[PDB]
């Protein structure tokens, strides 16, 4: 009986043949295996289905941005964001090197492109042999290290020979036998491009790939290793059906110009022709503003590199163009109809939260649980997972180490909460009492736990000075070094102008007085906590509850609290809200140091002001609608990192449909709670009853569009 014909067997304890000390780990990749494939065509894939049913499976695995082979395949083995590991796209360009990059190019084998540290390099430093086969980055030597067994990429090599090649390596002597293995197949990406996600060719391809895995599993059984190997069946991205009618050509707005170069696809980027002479000299801001809102329902959007949604993490690299394009699903962008390969072919590269961009992940073996279905996770988390499977100390990556502990029978690494680096001090009443020049028209422990029911945010800033200001409706962590609130937490239940009051607990700043704000300047103040809480709550009008805010952003901020926040309180039976300013001027996704903060502090209206680049907001509720936010058994989080812009060009307000464009901005700039943690230097939910590993799972979560 073949392996696929046998039923499930619990591998609680690894059954390894002699000469084996611990079960090896094989990483099997199927390029272009969209997550929807297994959902729908499970009955046509008997081998893959058994691996799903006897292992740990996830409906959707979220890939990196853009959704391309090389960036994702390399992010898997490095656990790094594409903006950090160097491989931004299949085709890209580095200004500092004056060289282009391509799959079919001599520059591909250049070690100057590959940054970070792949797993086989990690394994080599800790005396662990690795045998790879056609994995991106295996051909090139990184840090002067090459895998003990490698093969330079040759797509003409038949798949069946690749499987046998790995099977032959498994028979090598214990000292010359690798402990880590990789496998790569071009299907069903190839069939996906040429015929589309819904075709007879992909079904034949899925079945072809399915029998090939069955060949591997039968091969493992004949070697007596079917219960002695950790298998990770993964993919790089999904596949979307392209259309000729749904394609964007830049020439229609610019003309047959030759001063600009466009990297075509659903994740388009633009650089000038005179490069690197005018790579920075070219002002992209003008071109971006000239391309925005040209159509009634435009299916593309010009984005300056820092203005992209933070969830994408696609800014802090030299290779990423300062001008990018975000497109609606099923849409691609190009300069001229001649540059593109084809318009009506199967494509990928769209937003990594799109439904069809989702990838496959199945973990099978003695180390993985049997028939366990887990929630979605990013591919950068897999790197740390493999280190635990190979007994390796992981290189510094972007994955929350330990967040995938629920997949394993016996977790190797037990995570802990980050220590508080902030210098926590107290603010008593000391300075009374200045005139604000404002016109106004006519115990403690119980109120603390009510405002921060999951625990106060911990200050990971080192070594920032923060005070805790307690009110009757909210608790705010105030910064003494910046003289503004870092965060404000409050609970809003299911059913419950030009004036301000001086908070005598904080030192007075000239920007706290209402006389500072005129009706002419676009810059004003906003509240972190809405004043319309519970008559009218006056402590929300404290000076310590205001932040510098553009008038254009107040349109979004007021609608967020007056309409959406109240609706969410009814749908989710109350919500706990934590809000605050975000300062990331170097657009690296992490909080700025005091040094760079002083460099970006503008002066306006004769006063020095540090104005926020973004504003974060975390909404927390109960998973059980019968419970209020003060009595949750399990949490329901959703975070947002909203861009603080002087105008609403991104939204195309023109047409004046306010209730529509705001929510579309909210949904677009949704982010992981971890993302907020990384960018604000705060740590949430530390006093929550669930374990650290569970809390990492919660904080690294993002919803899939469509
Ligand atoms: C995802 O995960 C990845 C990996 O964990 C994160 O990427 C890492 O980000 C951090 C912070 O952004 C990076 O650290 C910085 O590295 C840069 C670059 O290093 C080089 O910079 C100069 C080259 O021209 C040069 O000055 C440096 O030379 C030495 O510098 C000092 C001298 O004493 C020494 O300590 C170094 O070891 C070097 O020998 C170097 O060649 C660097 O500029 C940064 O310096 C800042 O911080 C230091 C204090 O640490 C300070 O002194 C400086 O003034 C400056 O403020 C900093 O070290 C790191 O390189 C990234 N790692 C990788 C592999 O990419 C990423 O942050 C995560 N992303 C997200 C979104 O979370
Ligand atoms: N190491 C590797 C792995 C894949 N590739 C190529 O990358 C292609 C996949 O790219 P996309 O999915 O991004 O379009 C495969 O068809 C293959 O020919 C390569 O050139 N070198
Ligand atoms: C950059 O590369 C191009 C193409 O090879 C070359 O013609 C040009 O001379 C290079 N520019 C610089 C500054 O080296
Ligand atoms: C690629 O692989 C095929 C199949 O093994 C082989 O015939 C061919 O010679 C290889 N091409 C190159 C360039 O090595
Ligand atoms: Ca920063
Ligand atoms: Zn691919
Ligand atoms: Zn592809």
Asked if residues 618 and 671 have their Cβ atoms less than 8 Å apart, the reply is: no
C-alpha distance from residue 602 to each of 316, 548, 598, 599, 606 (Å): 23, 12, 9, 8, 10
69 lines ligand 2 (CB under 6 A): yes
432: left (phi over 0), alpha (psi -120 to 50) or beta: beta
Ligand 4: which of 104, 133, 156 to mutate, most ligand atoms within 8 Å of CB? 156
The tokens describing 460, both together, are 């990971």
CA atoms within 13 A on the CB side of 351: 25
The domain that holds 101 is classified in CATH as 3.40.720.10
The rounded distance, in Å, linking the Cα atoms of 505 and 543 is 10
Question: Taking the CB of residue 607, how many other CB atoms lie within 10 A of it?
Answer: 12
- 180 and 275, same domain (yes or no): yes
The tokens describing 60, both together, are 């959707």
The tokens describing 542, both together, are 């404290």
Which ligand 2 atom is at minimum distance from the Cα of 103?
A: 20
Q: Which residue reads 């809405």 in tokens?
A: 530
The rounded distance, in Å, linking the Cα atoms of 34 and 46 is 17
Distance 192 CA to ligand 2 centre (A): 13
The tokens describing 234, both together, are 């993964």
The rounded distance, in Å, linking the Cα atoms of 544 and 483 is 8
First to last CA, the chain: 42
- Tell me the three-class secondary structure of 45-67, residue by residue: CHHHHHHHHCCEEECCEECCCCC
- 374 and 329, same domain (yes or no): yes
The rounded distance, in Å, linking the Cα atoms of 94 and 200 is 40
Which ligand 4 atom is at minimum distance from the Cα of 154?
A: 1
Distance 195 CA to ligand 4 centre (A): 26
Asked if residues 78 and 117 have their Cβ atoms less than 8 Å apart, the reply is: yes
- Measuring CA to CA, which residue among 232, 313, 314 is closest to residue 671? 313
433 lines ligand 4 (CB under 6 A): no
Distance 360 CA to ligand 7 centre (A): 15
The tokens describing 228, both together, are 């002695």
- Letter string b/e over residues 272-305, b meaning 16 or more CB atoms within 10 A of that residue's CB: beeeeeebeebebeebbeebbbeeeebbbbbbeb
- 349 and 426, same domain (yes or no): no
- Letter string b/e over residues 346-368, b meaning 16 or more CB atoms within 10 A of that residue's CB: bbbbbbbbbbbbbbbbbbbbbbb
Active site residues: 69
144: left (phi over 0), alpha (psi -120 to 50) or beta: left
Angle between helices 46-53 and 200-222 (to 10 degrees): 60
Q: Which one of 375, 394, 413 terminates a domain?
A: 413
Asked if residues 460 and 679 have their Cβ atoms less than 8 Å apart, the reply is: no
For residues 670, 671, 673, 679, the Cα torsion angle rounded to the nearest 10 degrees is: -120
Q: Is the dihedral of CA 646, 651, 656, 661 positive or negative?
A: negative
Q: Is the dihedral of CA 342, 343, 346, 348 positive or negative?
A: positive
Resolution in A: 3.2
Which residue CA neighbors atom 51 of ligand 1 most closely? 593
Asked if residues 540 and 527 have their Cβ atoms less than 8 Å apart, the reply is: yes
Asked if residues 451 and 476 have their Cβ atoms less than 8 Å apart, the reply is: no
Distance 9 CA to ligand 1 centre (A): 48
Backbone phi, then psi, for 207, in 5-degree steps? Answer: -65, -35
The tokens describing 365, both together, are 């073996």
For residues 84, 95, 322, 596, the Cα torsion angle rounded to the nearest 10 degrees is: 60
Per DSSP, 696 falls in state H
- 347 and 440, same domain (yes or no): no
Question: Taking the CB of residue 595, how many other CB atoms lie within 10 A of it?
Answer: 7
Which residue CA neighbors atom 3 of ligand 2 most closely? 136
489 lines ligand 2 (CB under 6 A): no
- 552 and 682, same domain (yes or no): yes
77: left (phi over 0), alpha (psi -120 to 50) or beta: alpha
Which ligand 2 atom is at minimum distance from the Cα of 236?
A: 12
Domain of 389 in residue numbering reads as 1-413
The tokens describing 561, both together, are 């609290």
Distance 69 CA to ligand 7 centre (A): 6
* Residues across the chain: 706
Q: Which ligand approaches the C-alpha of residue 359 most closely?
A: 6
Distance between alpha carbon 425 and the CA centroid of its chain, in Å? 34
- 399 and 418, same domain (yes or no): no
Q: Which one of 413, 447, 467 terminates a domain?
A: 413
Q: Is beta strand 56-58 parallel, antiparallel or unpaired with respect to 247-249? A: unpaired
Per DSSP, 494 falls in state S
The rounded distance, in Å, linking the Cα atoms of 679 and 6 is 50
- 170 and 216, same domain (yes or no): yes
Q: Which ligand approaches the C-alpha of residue 194 most closely?
A: 7
The tokens describing 5, both together, are 């014909």
- Measuring CA to CA, which residue among 658, 28, 74, 25 is closest to residue 398? 74
Ligand 4: which of 133, 154, 164 to mutate, most ligand atoms within 8 Å of CB? 154
Asked if residues 614 and 580 have their Cβ atoms less than 8 Å apart, the reply is: no
Q: Number of structural domains, the chain?
A: 2
- Measuring CA to CA, which residue among 427, 487, 426, 475 is closest to residue 450? 475
Q: How was this structure determined?
A: X-ray
Q: Is 588 helix (H, G, I), strand (E, B) or coil?
A: coil
- 562 and 673, same domain (yes or no): yes
User: Taking the CA atoms of the chain, what radius of gyration do you get in angstroms?
Assistant: 27
Which ligand 2 atom is at minimum distance from the Cα of 193?
A: 14
Distance between alpha carbon 657 and the CA centroid of its chain, in Å? 30
Distance 505 CA to ligand 6 centre (A): 57
The rounded distance, in Å, linking the Cα atoms of 389 and 131 is 15
The tokens describing 627, both together, are 């419970």
Q: Is 578 helix (H, G, I), strand (E, B) or coil?
A: strand
Q: Which ligand approaches the C-alpha of residue 186 most closely?
A: 2
The rounded distance, in Å, linking the Cα atoms of 131 and 178 is 5
Distance 286 CA to ligand 5 centre (A): 25
89 lines ligand 2 (CB under 6 A): no
136 lines ligand 2 (CB under 6 A): yes
Which ligand 4 atom is at minimum distance from the Cα of 161?
A: 5
C-alpha distance from residue 697 to each of 375, 415, 627, 636 (Å): 9, 12, 22, 12
CA angle (64 as vertex; 63, 69 as ends), nearest 5: 80
Ligand 1: which of 397, 398, 673, 679 to mutate, most ligand atoms within 8 Å of CB? 398
- 531 and 675, same domain (yes or no): yes
Distance 93 CA to ligand 3 centre (A): 12
CA angle (617 as vertex; 616, 619 as ends), nearest 5: 155
- 214 and 80, same domain (yes or no): yes
- 492 and 405, same domain (yes or no): no
Question: Taking the CB of residue 174, how many other CB atoms lie within 10 A of it?
Answer: 10
Per DSSP, 703 falls in state P
The tokens describing 89, both together, are 């796209």
Q: Which ligand approaches the C-alpha of residue 30 most closely?
A: 6
160 lines ligand 4 (CB under 6 A): no
Bridge partners (DSSP) of residue 683 are: 458
The rounded distance, in Å, linking the Cα atoms of 320 and 91 is 11
The tokens describing 598, both together, are 């002083």
Residues with CB under 6 Å of ligand 1 are 80-81, 84, 116, 313, 396-398, 588-590, 678
Ligand 2: which of 65, 88, 186 to mutate, most ligand atoms within 8 Å of CB? 186
Q: Which residue reads 């699903």 in tokens?
A: 329
The tokens describing 191, both together, are 């069939």
Distance 98 CA to ligand 3 centre (A): 6
- Measuring CA to CA, which residue among 379, 385, 459 is closest to residue 415? 385
680 lines ligand 2 (CB under 6 A): no
Q: Which residue reads 């649980």 in tokens?
A: 369
- 406 and 508, same domain (yes or no): no
The tokens describing 373, both together, are 């279905």
Q: Is beta strand 25-30 parallel, antiparallel or unpaired with respect to 180-185? A: parallel
CB-count exposure of residue 17 (10 Å: 0-12, 13-18, 19+): exposed
Element (H, E) at 69: helix 69-78
C-alpha distance from residue 102 to each of 88, 152, 263, 329 (Å): 11, 15, 12, 25
90 lines ligand 2 (CB under 6 A): yes
Q: Which residue reads 């180490």 in tokens?
A: 401
Which residue CA neighbors atom 4 of ligand 2 most closely? 136
Q: Is the dihedral of CA 151, 157, 163, 165 positive or negative?
A: negative
- Measuring CA to CA, which residue among 144, 90, 108 is closest to residue 99? 108
156 lines ligand 4 (CB under 6 A): yes
Q: Which one of 413, 443, 463 terminates a domain?
A: 413
């Amino acid at each position: 009986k073949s392996w696929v014909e046998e039923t499930c067997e619990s591998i609680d304890t690894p059954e390894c043949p002699a000469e084996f000390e611990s079960p090896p780990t094989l990483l099997f990749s199927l390029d272009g295996f969209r997550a929807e494939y297994l959902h729908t065509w499970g009955g046509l894939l008997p081998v893959i289905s058994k691996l799903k049913n006897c292992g740990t499976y996830t409906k959707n695995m979220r890939p990196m941005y853009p959704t391309k082979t090389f960036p994702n395949h390399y992010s898997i083995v490095t656990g790094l964001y594409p903006e950090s590991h160097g491989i931004i796209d299949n085709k890209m360009y580095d200004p500092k090197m004056n060289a282009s990059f391509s799959l079919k190019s001599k520059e591909k084998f250049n070690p100057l492109w590959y940054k970070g540290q792949p797993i086989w390099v990690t394994a080599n430093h800790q005396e662990v042999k690795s045998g790879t086969y056609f994995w991106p980055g295996s051909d090139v030597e990184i840090d002067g290290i090459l895998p003990d067994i490698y093969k330079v990429y040759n797509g003409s090599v038949p798949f069946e020979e690749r499987i046998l090649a790995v099977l032959e390596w498994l028979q090598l002597p214990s000292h010359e036998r690798p402990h880590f293995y990789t496998l790569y197949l071009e299907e069903p990406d190839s069939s996906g491009h040429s015929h589309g996600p819904v075709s007879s060719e992909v079904i034949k391809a899925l079945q072809k790939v399915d029998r090939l895995v069955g060949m591997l599993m039968d091969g493992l059984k004949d070697l007596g290793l079917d219960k002695c190997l950790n298998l990770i069946l993964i993919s790089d991205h999904g596949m979307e059906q392209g259309s000729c009618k749904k394609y964007v050509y830049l020439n229609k707005y610019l003309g047959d110009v030759n001063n600009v170069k466009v990297v075509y696809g659903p994740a388009a980027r633009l650089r000038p022709t005179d490069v690197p002479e005018t790579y920075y000299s070219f002002n992209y801001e003008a071109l971006a503003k000239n391309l925005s809102c040209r159509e009634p329902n435009q299916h593309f959007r010009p984005y300056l590199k820092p203005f992209l949604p933070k969830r994408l993490h696609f800014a802090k690299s030299d290779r990423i163009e300062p001008l990018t394009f975000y497109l609606d699903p099923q849409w691609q962008l190009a300069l001229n109809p001649s540059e593109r390969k084809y318009c009506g072919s199967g494509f990928h590269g769209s937003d990594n939260l799109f439904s069809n961009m989702q990838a496959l992940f199945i973990g099978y073996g003695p180390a993985f649980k049997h028939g366990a279905e887990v929630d979605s996770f990013e591919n950068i988390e897999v790197y740390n997972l493999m280190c635990d499977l190979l007994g390796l100390i992981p290189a510094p990556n972007n994955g929350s180490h330990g967040s995938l502990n629920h997949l394993l029978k016996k977790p190797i690494y037990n995570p802990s909460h980050p220590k508080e680096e902030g210098f926590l001090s107290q603010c008593p009443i000391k300075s009374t009492s200045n005139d604000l020049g404002c016109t106004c028209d006519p115990e403690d422990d119980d109120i603390y736990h009510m405002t921060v029911p999951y625990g106060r945010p911990r200050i990971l800033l080192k070594q920032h000075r923060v005070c805790l200001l307690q009110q009757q409706q909210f608790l705010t962590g105030y910064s003494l070094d910046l003289l503004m609130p870092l965060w404000a937490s409050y609970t809003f239940l299911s059913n419950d102008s030009n004036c301000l009051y001086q908070d005598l607990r904080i030192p007075l700043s000239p920007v706290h007085k209402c006389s500072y704000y005129k009706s002419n300047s676009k810059l004003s103040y906003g509240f972190l906590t809405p004043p319309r809480l519970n008559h009218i709550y006056s402590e929300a009008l404290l000076t310590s509850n205001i932040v510098p805010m553009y008038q254009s952003f107040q349109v979004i901020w007021h609608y967020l609290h007056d309409t959406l926040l109240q609706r969410y309180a009814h749908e989710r039976n109350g919500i706990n809200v934590v809000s605050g300013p975000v300062f990331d001027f170097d657009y690296d996704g992490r909080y700025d140091s005091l040094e760079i903060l002083k460099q970006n502090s503008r002066v306006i209206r004769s006063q020095e002001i540090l104005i926020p680049t973004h504003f974060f907001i975390v909404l927390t509720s109960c998973k059980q609608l019968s419970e209020t936010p003060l009595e949750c058994s399990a949490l329901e989080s959703s975070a947002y990192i909203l861009p603080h812009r002087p105008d609403n060009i991104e939204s195309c307000t023109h047409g004046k449909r306010e209730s529509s464009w705001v929510e579309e901005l909210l949904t677009l700039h949704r982010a992981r709670v971890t993302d907020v943690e990384l960018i604000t230097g705060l740590s949430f939910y530390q006093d929550r009853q669930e374990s650290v590993s569970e809390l990492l799972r919660l904080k690294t979560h993002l919803p899939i569009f469509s």
